[PDB]
Amino acid sequence: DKRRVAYFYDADVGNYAYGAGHPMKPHRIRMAHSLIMNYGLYKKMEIYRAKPATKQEMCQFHTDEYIDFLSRVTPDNLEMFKRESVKFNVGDDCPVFDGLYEYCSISGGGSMEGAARLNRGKCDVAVNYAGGLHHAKKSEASGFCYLNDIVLGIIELLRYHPRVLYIDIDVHHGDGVEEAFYTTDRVMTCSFHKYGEFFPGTGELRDIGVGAGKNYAVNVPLRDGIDDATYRSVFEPVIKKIMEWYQPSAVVLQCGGDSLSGDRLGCFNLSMEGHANCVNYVKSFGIPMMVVGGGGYTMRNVARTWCFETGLLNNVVLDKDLPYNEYYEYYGPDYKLSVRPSNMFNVNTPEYLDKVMTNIFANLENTK
Amino acid sequence: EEVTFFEKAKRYIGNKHLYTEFLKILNLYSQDILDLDDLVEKVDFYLGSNKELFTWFKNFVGYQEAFGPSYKRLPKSDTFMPCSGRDDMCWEVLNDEWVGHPVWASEDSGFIAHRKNQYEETLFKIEEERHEYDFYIESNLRTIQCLETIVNKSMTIYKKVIRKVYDKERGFEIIDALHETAPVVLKRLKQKDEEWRRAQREWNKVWRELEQKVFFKSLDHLGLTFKQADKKLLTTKQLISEISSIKVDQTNKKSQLDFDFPDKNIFYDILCLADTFITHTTAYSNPDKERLKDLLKYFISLFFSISFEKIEESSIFNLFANTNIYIFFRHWTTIYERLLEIKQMNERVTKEINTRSTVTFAKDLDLLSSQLSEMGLDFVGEDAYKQVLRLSRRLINGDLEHQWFEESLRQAYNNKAFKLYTIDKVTQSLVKHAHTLMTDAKTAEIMALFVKDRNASTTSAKDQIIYRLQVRSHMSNTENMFRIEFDKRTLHVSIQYIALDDL
Amino acid sequence: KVSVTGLPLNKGPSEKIKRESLWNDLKTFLTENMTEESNIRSTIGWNEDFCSACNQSGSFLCCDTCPKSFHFLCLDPPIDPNNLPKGDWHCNECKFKIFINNSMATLKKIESNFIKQNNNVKIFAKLLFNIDSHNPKQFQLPNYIKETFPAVKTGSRGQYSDENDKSYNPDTHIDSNSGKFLICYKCNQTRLGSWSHPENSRLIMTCDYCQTPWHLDCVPRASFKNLGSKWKCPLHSPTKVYKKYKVWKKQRLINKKNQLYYEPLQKIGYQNNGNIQIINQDFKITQIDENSIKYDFFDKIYKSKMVQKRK
Amino acid sequence: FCSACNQSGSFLCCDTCPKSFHFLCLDPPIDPNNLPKGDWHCNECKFKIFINNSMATLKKIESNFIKQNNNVKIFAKLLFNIDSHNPKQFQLPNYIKNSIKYDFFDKIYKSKMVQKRKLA
Amino acid sequence: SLQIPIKLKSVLVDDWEYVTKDKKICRLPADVTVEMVLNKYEHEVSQELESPGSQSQLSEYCAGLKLYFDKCLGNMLLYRLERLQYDELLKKSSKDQKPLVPIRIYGAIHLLRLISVLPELISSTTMDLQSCQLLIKQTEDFLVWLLMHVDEYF
Amino acid sequence: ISLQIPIKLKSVLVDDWEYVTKDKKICRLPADVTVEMVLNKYEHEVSQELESPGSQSQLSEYCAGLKLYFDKCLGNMLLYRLERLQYDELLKKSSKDQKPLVPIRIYGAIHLLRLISVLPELISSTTMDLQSCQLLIKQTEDFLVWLLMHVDEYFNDKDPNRSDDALYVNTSSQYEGVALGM
Ligand SMILES: [Zn+2]
Ligand SMILES: [Zn+2]
Ligand SMILES: [Zn+2]
Ligand SMILES: [Zn+2]
Ligand SMILES: [Zn+2]
Ligand SMILES: [Zn+2]
Ligand SMILES: [Zn+2]
């Protein structure tokens, strides 16, 4: 394909942190950058620093009260906001730290600027790993997410494109993005997630949409221990059929590392290559794409996967020997660019997946 | 035919409590409370496995928005909330009515978290400490760089840095003074950075040695629990249950179990392991060891017709057996299948181990483990299959610990050889089952009849009946029999479970 | 101070941890000189631990004359927490007992209110007077309505509860009551698998209402049910129907004392709801018998056949 | 007074209830000379002792009779009550002045003949 | 209640006058008895019903009407001046030792009075509101059919 | 003491309990038919039948007393905990326009039904005489019979996800969080 790649990075994004024991850390974004520059990928990409988002730009999706609470809340004065903390779920589930608003603005500005560069034709691939918060919904924090920057980026994309595809390969259901566009045919959301007694609670096979957006929401509920050979056998046919029938003008891809083997919260068994195969397959279609990096709670694995995927977007295959970045001590015994799957058992039988794909293909008939 | 549909459905359903619900559904349809679609879907759930009755029913009755379970509709009053930056297109495409909220989708109960082993927890703790040290050091370094840029010639970072350095609660006054003392904070921060970096070096050493031992254990899931599950699931009852289940499934719709042996060197490897255990074990007398070796060699040479001379220096056939011989054969097949699985990846794993490159920037220089290299448990050269066999022989002898054997297998096969952790116990059980095949009169007579039949090589159809009748005469009248069929053209084994069908 | 390592963050080795955890293509510095500002956005031009009203946890506004604490909303009228009363606060009964409760002459005041309301209402005057001495209290059904339905129970918080509220493991395929194998209704197989090949087995569920067993792959489903409502297999009556709209709901279960039964004499065409039984006067349960159901079904099929063939 | 035609003549007196009936105004009629030579009860006051003393309890005989006469079920509650009333003269209404499958198959068979001959 | 046509009311009053004033009891079993009328009704009406449930209802109604005319004839469906005649019939049935079938003795005059007081009998029962309507509808249909064939019966 | 409620009304009350405490639904306020309208229709339909003034003035007295008791006790004992926030909002909407809140003109027919369900306990916790209790119970039972007659036009069953004019509405997360968390 030989696309031109815009890459967004803010050097201050890594200086914000959640609580002491909180699994979600922006530091991995600082790590994936350190590999990317040390592999020499800056010679193939255009590196930008997006202007942070403003309150009015955030309020295109969220409410004024929620955004106003986010711009005022502080760990010091949390006791003065007792009704808003339960309104917006910014208490114990999603904590409040020192750099919440600037981090949210950085993420949203990155996503919106990437979408804007895709609109103007400046590039054909926009990369923003700070983005990808796919859980916040317009009035409340959810799943460690406080601002849905994917929705803002898709809104910026809809000003030039008739149809936009959104693909989610995180273990969690993309509840915020699916809910935001649940009644429209302009945006088609497709999620591959673990369904059961898992956090998003939503993402059933019968959640195809409401109203004009009926049949424009696809959910693939999977089981524990899925591996690369099965994940790709599910992912390629569904995405191919969506591409032929929905025919999107642009695609957003949330590359969350929650599906990698060895994650704290995830329960999948995907290696680095099985996770990057999805990005390669989506890139092989030729339409404009925006890659965002969402979940992931093992920094050494998600950073390596993001660096490998960024290399793949630049039409190169990176060497398996690390280039001695700053955080060299994080990368285990062999110090290789690889993520090793475990020997855990796969409970995704071919019959269950066959039934799921049959249902999805039956629903997809009414999108062309 | 319309008159007999109800009794047909009654017979097919096979239960009264379900036929009652079927009649209730039919009644609901008969009172104009159910449209035809729900009736057809319910009768699909009832008689859909049958293909003729369902089609007949559909052609008789003349069959010729879908809300999701995880979305509610809010009242329009609670919809208009001021979004200042929203536009006409934004109002057009964004959804404000339907809401999902996982808590409702959780049925107000909660979510189940994924179980994690202790090695993963240790890895998480190491990562947490690394992240804390790096976060503090980098934040201090960025504040230092900004301060140097100020002195020599993006809001909360410096404030939180100087609030962390000054914990006396006086730090706010220092921030105020900074807004109106730059060298003072400069020299304080540089010293903090230096001491934190030294502590980070020492902790990095400690963390490296700690992680470098539990990393491979963290990725082993089925292996950790393995050597308790193998003991519980490799019993006679489990195998009988498996074959009985296969037979029951077949009868609800002569070759219950199928085995294919594509290699014969594995037989010699299993014989070598068995002989090693027999020589080592202090559980049999001196003549009994020779008797066990002779039994094993004779059985393997007679059943599979491999050889009789090279084996000790290294036309379908049928066997009617009781539980003992079946269990012995199942143990042999278990060992063979495990060794075959570890052997068919010989070339790939051997190439990986030999062509395993190392990083030159810091891996070769500083951060390496010769721990497995100090005991020769690194598989350099020493072809992986033969090295695994040698280590298994060492473990059987007793001069190798289980921990180091498992660790070498984990690091050499990427946790794909976890099923060999019990090779010693499986070999011991195979030897014990070979022994009980000697010290039982009935089993000895059955084995003698099998030897006579196998060596006859020219028998009529009566070989199928009179041989089975004689074996049953040597057998009891209540417990099971198994028919093991061997084909030499492709070396194929078929096991049939004749519980009492011979009576 | 103390960090996650348990050390002041400046020490390092921690000798005990040492003994426990031991055996015995350019850099990033050029990222500050190659980031072009991107500002081409199209939008860039812009005493008790519970509540005396509901008996539940949470933040409370306490009283001083008694050990009773109320929620801010569990109060008449509700009080906004930001606009604190900022003064001596009591509940209704404390105010009444401090200010009005003269027990020797209270009856005279009640009679005065009685005669004051005698012009309009005297059957409720005592009830109206009895309302100022009571604190707010959450509504609950008065314990003789719940007992009418022997399937409804009260949860810990007082909410409605009904009878729908509750590696390789081969023993789940065994009944354990008779030693037989659990045979799936859809496929007529148990699919036990084997220890050699644990991927040949299928998970089985054994529905909680009629005890019939199903495979997770035969009924489309991903995981087991362990926390939410009880699982019900697809072999049951809907008990709630939307007919094109009109809503039909099956009657609740009544205690057998008031559960009236009746057998009609018509037995061929008899309009009943889905409240039947195969063998105050608004909850009759018709006893219908199987032959009548057969005749009704055949009648409906034949009548619809004529209705369509007339056209 | 004969409580069947409400006229006068030679009656048959009762014992438990103060009622008098004619010898011919009975079902079945009795020869006037042929006395019962014992205890005689009319249609009433004989079902009363039948249901209050000999059988077990009230409202159970009716169910048994209805179940027994399930072949004619719409008239069961009338057939049960017909054997409880004394005979009366016919006064004007005052406003004039495997046995189941055989039936199932026969019903379907006749119904389908009607269907076919009506269609064409 | 029941909707009895005016002509059938006139026939009933004519019979009342012909029995209670000028005593002219009709002859012993006539050419058309209740059984013949009921079988011909069930035979000629069943050929115009397309529903098996309606066929079962019609058959059950006819059988119940026969079995109810058996036990009600001598009870309350005869005038006093006729009872003696009934008695003699009974005596004949006693002498010959042949069972009595009153469906095949009385006919087309005594079935009409049988469905003339049915609302009274139904009201003195505990039947539900839904089966009584079916009985009334069946009796009305039979009354209309009998009024259609009046010149050849009575 | 003892109140004879028809079984269908008990089913209605249990359905209300299930909707509020399990489905997290509330009432669509202001109601289409309020308590005042129901009581006015009952009084007009019943008083127009009988003619004795002694039995006619008692009906008006009963209706007026019922209205007063509802107005005085709805904010105290007739609301579940989830509904209270909604109540508070109404009060604010009442306080911003200087209009006092009159609950018999907002709530209707389902809060009256649950008003006359704890009347035995309210009567028991008083010093009332015997024949007054008998009269109150008789009037309440007559009203309950009348309401059971007109049950289909006051308690319909339509899903909030399908009809905008149902009796119940779904609550949002921002509402439920404040209601059951603060
Ligand atoms: Zn996630
Ligand atoms: Zn409370
Ligand atoms: Zn108090
Ligand atoms: Zn199955
Ligand atoms: Zn079930
Ligand atoms: Zn008489
Ligand atoms: Zn008597």
Author numbering:
A (entry chain B): 17 to 384
B (entry chain A): 664 to 727, 749 to 837, 859 to 885, 890 to 962, 972 to 1032, 1134 to 1322
C (entry chain D): 107 to 130, 166 to 187, 259 to 378, 400 to 477, 489 to 523, 534 to 565
D (entry chain F): 262 to 358, 545 to 567
E (entry chain E): 221 to 374
F (entry chain C): 220 to 401
The authors write:
The Rpd3 small (Rpd3S) complex recognizes histone H3 trimethylation on lysine 36 (H3K36me3) and deacetylates histones H3 and H4 at multiple sites across transcribed regions. Here we solved the cryo-electron microscopy structures of Saccharomyces cerevisiae Rpd3S in its free and H3K36me3 nucleosome-bound states. We demonstrated a unique architecture of Rpd3S, in which two copies of Eaf3–Rco1 heterodimers are asymmetrically assembled with Rpd3 and Sin3 to form a catalytic core complex.
For structural analysis, we co-expressed full-length S. cerevisiae Rpd3, Sin3, Rco1, Eaf3 and Ume1 in a baculovirus–insect cell system and successfully reconstituted the Rpd3S holo-enzyme. Next, we performed single-particle cryo-EM analysis and acquired an overall structural map of Rpd3S at 3.2 Å resolution. Using a focused refinement strategy, we obtained 2.7 Å and 3.2 Å maps of two local regions, the head–bridge–right arm and the left arm of the Rpd3S complex, which enabled de novo model building of approximately 1,800 residues of Rpd3S components with high accuracy. In the structural model, we identified one copy of Rpd3 and Sin3, and two copies of Eaf3 and Rco1. The modelled structure contains residues 664–1322 of Sin3, 17–384 of Rpd3, 220–401 of Eaf3-A, 221–374 of Eaf3-B, 107–565 of Rco1-A and 262–358 of Rco1-B, which constitute a catalytic core complex with Rpd3 positioned at the centre. Although Ume1 exists as a stoichiometric component of Rpd3S, its map is missing. Both the Sin3 C-terminal tail and Ume1 are invisible in the map, suggesting their flexible disposition. In the Rpd3S complex, we observed that a long α-helix of Sin3 (α1) within the FHF motif covers the basic surface of Rpd3 and inserts two Glu fingers (Glu811 and Glu812) into the inositol phosphate-binding pocket.
